[PDB]
């Protein structure tokens, strides 16, 4: 029951973790 990440290799415990991670990692922060 863990999600992972297709842009790098980090992974979560629960999908919003994910989710906000790619939102402040790759998803356009710029
Ligand atoms: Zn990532």
Redesign the pocket.
Request: glycine fraction near 0%.
């Given at each position: 029951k863990t999600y992972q990440?297709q842009?790098?290799?980090?992974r979560s415990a629960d999908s919003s973790n994910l989710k906000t991670?790619?939102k402040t990692?790759?998803s356009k922060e710029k």
């Open positions: 990440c842009y790098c290799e980090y991670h790619i990692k790759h």
